[PDB]
């Protein structure tokens, strides 16, 4: 198991514009297109991202390319963030994957808002961190996914994905 297989399980794959759990236009493997309500604004963002007139449909290769870019960007975002970097540096490999998953889903800013949890992770207080992470809109809105990630931070294993 690795970050790519883990995100692939959590995000699925869709080759046609779809709405995400928050109602926003997305495509591929969790690639957010826009927060705007406009499907036109989304097809415009899609063509811009792929570099062709897509008509709201992409191939598997294109989906995977957006995916590779998005993971790389998430990792680079963590490394450049003063709040996130030290947490990431402190973690083992499995748990680093869980932080990446969170950043991919909610963005750098979103995660950076889990101040108290981040402190507990840094301190390696796993059970406590798991409890605190659950007191969040994130957990209430996407409970199954959040439990998998939380279990990952709790145990330092891939059991939730097995
Ligand atoms: Cl892009
Ligand atoms: Cl869920």
Curated annotation (Swiss-Prot):
What is this protein's expression induced by?
Answer: Expressed late in the viral replication.
Result when mutating residue 117 to I: 500-fold decrease in enzymatic activity
SUPFAM superfamilies given in the database record: Lysozyme-like
Q: Which pH dependence is annotated? A: Optimum pH is 7.3.
Q: Which PANTHER family match?
A: T4-TYPE LYSOZYME 1-RELATED
> An example of a Gene Ontology BP annotation on this entry?
peptidoglycan catabolic process
Residues annotated as binding substrate: 32, 104, 117, 132
Protein name from the UniProt record: Endolysin
- Per the Swiss-Prot or TrEMBL record, the active site comprises 11, 20
What is the similarity comment for this entry? Belongs to the glycosyl hydrolase 24 family.
Listed EC numbers: 3.2.1.17
What's an example GO cellular component term for this entry?
A: host cell cytoplasm
Superkingdom, according to UniProt? Viruses
What is this enzyme's catalytic activity, as reactions?
A: Hydrolysis of (1->4)-beta-linkages between N-acetylmuramic acid and N-acetyl-D-glucosamine residues in a peptidoglycan and between N-acetyl-D-glucosamine residues in chitodextrins
Q: Where in the cell is it found?
A: Host cytoplasm
Q: Outcome of mutating residue 20 to E/Q, per the record? A: Loss of 99% of enzymatic activity
The protein's UniProt keywords, in alphabetical order, are: Antimicrobial, Bacteriolytic enzyme, Cytolysis, Glycosidase, Host cell lysis by virus, Host cytoplasm, Hydrolase, Viral release from host cell
Tell me one Pfam family matched here: Phage_lysozyme
